Amino acid sequence: INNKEGLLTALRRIQLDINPKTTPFSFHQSVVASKRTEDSIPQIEDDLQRELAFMNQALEAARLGRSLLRKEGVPFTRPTDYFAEMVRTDATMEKVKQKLIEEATAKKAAAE
Amino acid sequence: DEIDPVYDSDDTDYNVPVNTIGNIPLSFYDSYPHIGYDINGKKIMRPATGDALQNLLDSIEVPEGWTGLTDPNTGKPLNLSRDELELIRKVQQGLIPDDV
Amino acid sequence: GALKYLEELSKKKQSDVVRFLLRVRCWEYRQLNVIHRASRPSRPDKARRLGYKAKQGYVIYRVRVRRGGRQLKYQRSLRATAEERVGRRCSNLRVLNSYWVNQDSTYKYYEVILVDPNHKAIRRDPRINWICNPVHKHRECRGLTSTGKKSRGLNKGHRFNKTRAGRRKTWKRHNTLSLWRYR
Amino acid sequence: MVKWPEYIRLQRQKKILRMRLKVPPAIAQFQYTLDKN
Amino acid sequence: GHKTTRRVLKERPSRRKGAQSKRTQFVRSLIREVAGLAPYERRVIELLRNGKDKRARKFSKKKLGTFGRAKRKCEELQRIIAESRRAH
Amino acid sequence: VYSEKELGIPQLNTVTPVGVTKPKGKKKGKVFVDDRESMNTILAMVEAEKQGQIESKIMRARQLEEIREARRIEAEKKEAERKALLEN
Amino acid sequence: HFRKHWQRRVRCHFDQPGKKVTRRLARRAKAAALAPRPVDKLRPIVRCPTVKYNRRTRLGRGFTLEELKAAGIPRLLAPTIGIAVDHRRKNLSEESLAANVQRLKDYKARLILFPRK
Amino acid sequence: DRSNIIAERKNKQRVLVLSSRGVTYRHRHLLNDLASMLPHGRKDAKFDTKSRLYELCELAELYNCNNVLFFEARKGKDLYMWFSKVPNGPTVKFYAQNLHTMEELHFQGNCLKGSRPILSFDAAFEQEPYLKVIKELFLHTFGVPQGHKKSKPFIDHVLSFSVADGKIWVRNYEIREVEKVKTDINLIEIGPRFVLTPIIIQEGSFGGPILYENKRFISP
RNA sequence: AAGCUCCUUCGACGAGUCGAGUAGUUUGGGAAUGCUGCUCAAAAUGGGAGGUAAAUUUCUUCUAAAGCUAAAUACCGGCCA
RNA sequence: UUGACCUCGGAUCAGGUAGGAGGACCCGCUGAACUUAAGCAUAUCAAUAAGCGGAGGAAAAGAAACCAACAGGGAUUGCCCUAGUAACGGCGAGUGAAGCGGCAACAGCUCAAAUUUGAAAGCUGGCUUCGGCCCGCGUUGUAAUUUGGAGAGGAUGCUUU
């Protein structure tokens, strides 16, 4: 069952006003896409084309948001002089590095 | 009734630091005059520079609130208040944990 | 029905009347011997529930055991260490069961029920004459008390697969190469 | 000076502790028994 | 699956194998009044008279361990405060 | 065992930020600075590196603050040069 | 899977005919003591549990207390006349009850009962 | 003012993340990963399954949260994600699938903890009704409001939401800027790789009558 | 002394235990697979374990923290054959 | 001054008991390393060997806080397959069960929570012609009745020693 009127009356009870003329982009930071991204993915089992489609959808969201955020004037670029908490700890960021060192040194030893 | 999403008096995140600094080690912002950034993005600087005679007197006789810890908010070392020191003593002794 | 009231009071053991009693008894038990004897159980409802009777041949002993680790942990429980120390002291008696009586920051206090297999009141009574048999020698040393049955995983279910008949017997069964005649 | 036996001291120190420590009302009502008459 | 005619069963005498007798409620209520309160229960009592129901409920969560036990203990202690002023 | 510079290892976003990463080889630039008073502090820094860390906490903090003051002076000259370039 | 010491935990079965004749002499000695009596006890017809074995019945452990009552066999006399009792099992259906009651009446018809002393 | 939102007009939003009673280490890591991206939320665990779904409403009222993100595990193998607005708002059931969290070393991306996201939604999120009320819930839950005093200032990650067959695919990427040749952007993937198939939508807070049903769901 | 039958009468069921957090050990088994230590510490139409997207935790199945008990099983030792 | 009751001790008092041996099999505690991966550390070896404690002719386990999702089964144990399956893993080496089903053998019970209260009805001693006398234990509870797929109490009428 899809009580399409019922979703509408429930939705307007929740809704906060998101209008670009009235509320700035700093409030919501949400972007809808022009394409529906189902046309971008022909086959779901195709892994590389699927991740490229999700990359490309957030690609335009990152570009469209950056233009709207620079105009409004809040900072966007993290300074080189700034350090804070990270979603992954420094220890997790280390063994990410030697995952690529042993992958790089394997292909150089394979060539050597 | 709609829930009013305010922070209660007993909540863990009732008071937050201004410095937007978590469990990051304070070895950073040592070679940098500033210490941390605030919510709006502007910069937070070290308050002042301690005197050599004051530091020598602090090394000979440490204060009551001295802990040897660098404050995540200011470049000066963090010192416990009188009420905080009394709270630690009442917790350790346990004779009166709560007043009245 | 005085013991139903004692059962509810023993459940509530951090409350004011009982914590007072547990404080003053722990001071007394500390200055007595480690493996001293009790003329009457300190918890008569727990002794009754565990099999103690006011009969000749039943004695109660109180043990203090040191608490803490052995980050290696001693797999023997503190009750199992308590039960082993009574049996090495009262070597003529059989350890029936044990129960908790007191606690401290350095020690735990247990009360152990012992049955004399050589008294005549015990051999005459068919509810306790089973402990007279020579299979039940030193039950606390073989993990045959309620503490030992707990630590050996002697329950039933998918949750206790490795230890429901003995892990060493099950490991012997699962590692045995069975070869038949007409293979 | 002289040394008392251990159980003599323990039962005497149980006197002082009972009269010094302040007792919850469940046990404190046992300190009030009846009169001779 | 298969269609079999169902039978009614005699009532299990192991149903509700706790203690729902009227006598065991007398023992539990009498012991609580004699015994008093734990130190942690005294803090929940003090918050409930002061009106800090949310702080008392959160304190019961940290002490007992599960939310349903926090509901149970705060309900029993609130009924103790209710019966205290009834005698008063 | 090979040198990390020879390996084409991507830059990771640790607690130390990546900033804006420059492409390798294609228009990689660098900076330019000589100074008079800040390079005097680089003299003060290098004997402190050569003679090792100071056991005295007061003198070690004093010599670090001098390098911090040199960086603050060098930065203030950089915004002064940026203001002069904006004027021109 | 020869990773452990398989040589010290290998069991051979040269006593398989020896255990067989020992097993037959145990059944022989059981009917020596219980001479007119049978060597086993009555077990009910029970339906195997899972959907793989729904359509096959087998011998269970003992009869329901309701199954003894419908067949007219008393519960404290049933173990003495060679009928196994199981208080854990329930009927839950009339087909399980009717099949086992009919089994108990068939046992009742074939039974020779002897008078005490 | 105890909202801890220094802003012009306030988005007073709190969420409460819960794992029920049978969550695996994979489910617990995803709950720890999501709660590291919401500074306006607090964590809870060991919720009794034998309790009632509207006692989740009592739980969040006690902790002063107007949204709940509930992790319900079946058999210790199947994850069900609940989104709701606690007093009266609608509720959505999901079935989580294909979980990948930050501890896997092949992700190679990182973002400032508590920093404000760029929520990326789909066109099909915008047109279709049942996904459109879902987009309202993710905007409230994954919002990280404006002046929140535990929110990092610099904005460096994009949360991606997309549909492929009938399922919502959630991806998280790191904003990275480089210089051009003679600043253009590129995203590097960070974490919570998981798939959400919409199961059923409730009008009530955790009860109420039933508005959307998915007649394509093949249960595990 | 005992078995039942009936009923305008009753029916007591195990706590420093369970459980929450943590450290160790162990397991095919971080619904913690079990066990131990440590901190906190329960309930009474209760509690434990399962099933189920099926619309709210609906239903199924048992009753932990007391105890005994032959046979089928093992056996390079003991009395023999 | 006398006499309890409670607790703690002495006695070359009476009556008993434990140590040690054995340890093939059994129950616990504690606990390696060599080896393998053509190097090696996770792992494996191995919850093994060595070390300690404790029984019997067997030991142990055992009458569900069980398995199940069925038309349900029904204490424990062992064999056959389940099955090299599920599950876990430098996913390499590897590790590795269980329910069901077919058999072997089958057996069930004792307490605590009750007021015998119109009668401690129970039990250890040691003195005896032995037939029955005292002493003590015990009401802070020894017998009888009862142990939750129950049970008690009245009534009821048959059936049992």
Curated annotation (Swiss-Prot), chain B:
Disulphide linkage map: none
UniProt subcellular location: Nucleus, Nucleolus; Nucleus, Nucleoplasm
Quaternary organization: Component of the NOP7 complex, composed of ERB1, NOP7 and YTM1. The complex is held together by ERB1, which interacts with NOP7 via its N-terminal domain and with YTM1 via a high-affinity interaction between the seven-bladed beta-propeller domains of the 2 proteins. The NOP7 complex associates with the 66S pre-ribosome.
Protein family (similarity comment): Belongs to the WD repeat BOP1/ERB1 family.
Role this protein plays: Component of the NOP7 complex, which is required for maturation of the 25S and 5.8S ribosomal RNAs and formation of the 60S ribosome.
Name recorded for this polypeptide: Ribosome biogenesis protein ERB1
Organism, as annotated: Chaetomium thermophilum (strain DSM 1495 / CBS 144.50 / IMI 039719)
Annotated gene: ERB1
